[PDB]
Amino acid sequence: MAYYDALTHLPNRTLFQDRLHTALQQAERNGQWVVLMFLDLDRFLGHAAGDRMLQEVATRLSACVSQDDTVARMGGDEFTLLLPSQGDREIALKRAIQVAELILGRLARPFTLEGREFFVTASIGVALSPQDGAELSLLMKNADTAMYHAKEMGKNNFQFYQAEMNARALERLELESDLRRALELGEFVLHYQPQFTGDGRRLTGAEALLRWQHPRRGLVPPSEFIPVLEEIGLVAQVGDWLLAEACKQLRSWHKAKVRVPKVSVNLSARQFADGQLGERIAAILYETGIPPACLELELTESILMSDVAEAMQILSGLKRLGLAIAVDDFGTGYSSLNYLKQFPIDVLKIDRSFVDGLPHGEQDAQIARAIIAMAHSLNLMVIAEGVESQAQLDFLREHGCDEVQGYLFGRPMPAEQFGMLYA
């Protein structure tokens, strides 16, 4: 079409502007964000090889974005990208960071024409609608301004139009950098929180809890760095380290006459979706010599109930491995009672938020009784988390809560102190 660049087959300037306008009008109607990127090359060649290079650039750019994103060619050495329908500021910001890093990484790679090797460098400017403009020409002014800022900083850079996003981008990249290194140097450590029978007479297991100690940031809370791990391929690899470390710990504790009956590991949504999950778990159980009965997986009702049919199969695979399954944070999500019984699950965990109102919050008291009753109706065992007070414990015990966990019974703890404190 007259609307496409004859060489790269990408939309031309006018078509791209129409789609940008459309994306802006729609975003504004749905309270969504749009990312606009401008990209310039210094190249860095031959005439025919030149046009062949632009073609390779184009291919590489298309490969960095999804189905719904547009890549286009403004002219000469300038390309633009459009990432529409981003749910909010932060999704937009992360997706922009991710796409821009991906692009610079792909364009770093050498261009192999005439048998030989060439390099190009790129400068990228990024502007996010609506904040940097909800109108196409303002959004473009600002992406272009960011681009030139990116140039004024040297080779292979991306800048946002907002300084605040540039700062946040730089830090995010450093965090990612540190987390890769954390795994390489082993800066992660496992702490264990003990689990008891409702009376407190007895230790039923330990919940393993990832911590991260960085020399400068100090100790980073799991809630900060875990989501970052899963936003890369890092989490499966960290999960492997963790599972193996807990299995080894179990080994040492048994050797040292510390009778810990089992250990619980939390799983993210990403780990749960992984096709090799059960395979990697079996692999680790085999290396460490520990049986599946010693292990329990903890998944949130949001992870299980989003796609119930898929979850049924994944869970069934894991049970055939002989391991137990607990539904973490229970009561904070949306659950089919139907599938709660069909899923081969073992345990419900009463979220801390409900335990916190005990014993004199009517709402929290009734919700907690209800969970216990559900659990026992489905032959599930339930443990209350976040038990911090004698009164909470009295209530839960009085109403048949099977197991209990919380600061009242001692904080999360490194393995050796754990053994001594609960031997």
Ligand X SMILES: Nc1nc2c(ncn2[C@@H]2O[C@@H]3COP(=O)(O)O[C@H]4[C@@H](O)[C@H](n5cnc6c(=O)[nH]c(N)nc65)O[C@@H]4COP(=O)(O)O[C@H]3[C@H]2O)c(=O)[nH]1
Binding site for ligand X (CB under 6 A): 193, 209-210, 221-223, 226, 242, 266-268, 298, 328-329, 352, 385-388, 406-407, 412
| Residue 152 annotated as binding site | no
CB atoms near residue 85 (< 10 Å): 15
- In the complex, the smallest distance separating the C-beta of residue 216 from its own copies, rounded to whole angstroms, is 40
Task: Give the span between the Cα atoms of 394 and 384, in whole angstroms.
Answer: 12
| Residue 329 annotated as binding site | yes
Q: Which does 369 bind (CB under 5 to 8 A by kind): Mg ion, ligand X, its own copies, none?
A: its own copies
Binders of Mg ion among 237-266, rule CB under 5 A? 266
| Residue 328 annotated as binding site | yes
- In the complex, the smallest distance separating the C-beta of residue 328 from Mg ion, rounded to whole angstroms, is 4
Query: Tokens 């099977």 appear where?
Result: 402
Size of the site for Mg ion (CB under 5 A): 4
Nearer to Mg ion, 39 or 340 (CB): 340
Q: Which DSSP helix (H) or strand (E) runs through 32?
A: none
Nearer to ligand X, 77 or 240 (CB): 240
SS3 of residue 85 by DSSP: strand
Task: Give the span between the Cα atoms of 72 and 208, in whole angstroms.
Answer: 49
Q: Which does 374 bind (CB under 5 to 8 A by kind): its own copies, ligand X, Mg ion, none?
A: its own copies
Asked if 329 interacts with Mg ion (CB under 5 A), we say: yes
- In the complex, the smallest distance separating the C-beta of residue 322 from ligand X, rounded to whole angstroms, is 21
Alpha helices of 109-221 — where are they, by DSSP H?
Answer: 136-151, 163-184
What does 255-310 look like in DSSP terms, one character per residue? HTT-----EEEE--HHHHH-TTHHHHHHHHHHHHT--GGGEEEEEEHHHHHTTHHH
- In the complex, the smallest distance separating the C-beta of residue 13 from its own copies, rounded to whole angstroms, is 11
Query: Tokens 């081969």 appear where?
Result: 344
Distance of CA 95 to the CA centre of its chain: 13
Q: Which does 406 bind (CB under 5 to 8 A by kind): Mg ion, ligand X, its own copies, none?
A: ligand X
Asked if 346 interacts with Mg ion (CB under 5 A), we say: no
- Half-sphere exposure (CA, 13 Å, Cβ side) for 3? 8
Q: Which does 34 bind (CB under 5 to 8 A by kind): its own copies, ligand X, Mg ion, none?
A: none
Q: Which two tokens stand for residue 86?
A: 């981003």
**Dihedral angle sign, alpha carbons of residues 164, 165, 170, 173:** positive
Nearer to ligand X, 69 or 298 (CB): 298
Q: Which does 160 bind (CB under 5 to 8 A by kind): ligand X, its own copies, Mg ion, none?
A: none
Nearer to Mg ion, 176 or 328 (CB): 328
Q: Which residues contact 172 (CB under 8 A, 6 or more apart)?
A: 94, 97, 228
Q: Which two tokens stand for residue 236?
A: 């499966």
Residue 332 vs residues 300, 350, 382: alpha-carbon distances, Å: 9, 9, 15
- In the complex, the smallest distance separating the C-beta of residue 396 from Mg ion, rounded to whole angstroms, is 17
Nearer to its own copies, 14 or 112 (CB): 14
Nearer to ligand X, 135 or 187 (CB): 187
Residue 71 vs residues 128, 250, 306, 368: alpha-carbon distances, Å: 16, 52, 32, 53
Binders of Mg ion among 98-157, rule CB under 5 A? none
| Residue of 176, 178, 245, 328 that binds Mg ion (CB under 5 A) | 328
Task: Give the span between the Cα atoms of 205 and 294, in whole angstroms.
Answer: 9
Asked if 298 interacts with Mg ion (CB under 5 A), we say: yes
Nearer to its own copies, 137 or 377 (CB): 377
- In the complex, the smallest distance separating the C-beta of residue 235 from ligand X, rounded to whole angstroms, is 7
Nearer to Mg ion, 266 or 335 (CB): 266
Residue 387 vs residues 124, 159, 354: alpha-carbon distances, Å: 51, 47, 10
| Residue 266 annotated as binding site | yes
Q: Which two tokens stand for residue 262?
A: 């089992």
Q: Which two tokens stand for residue 118?
A: 């060439």
- The conformational region for residue 186 under phi > 0 = left, psi -120 to 50 = alpha, else beta, is left
Nearer to ligand X, 100 or 220 (CB): 220
| Residue 352 annotated as binding site | yes
The site for its own copies (CB under 8 A) is made up of: 1-3, 14-15, 18, 26, 29, 67-68, 305, 331-338, 341-342, 354, 363, 366-367, 369-371, 373-374, 376-379
The residue ranges that bind Mg ion (CB under 5 A) are 266, 298, 328-329
Binding-site entries: 193, 207, 210-211, 266, 298, 328-329, 352, 385, 388, 407
Binding-site entries for Mg(2+): 207, 266, 298, 328-329, 385
Binding-site entries for 3',3'-c-di-GMP: 193, 210-211, 352, 388, 407
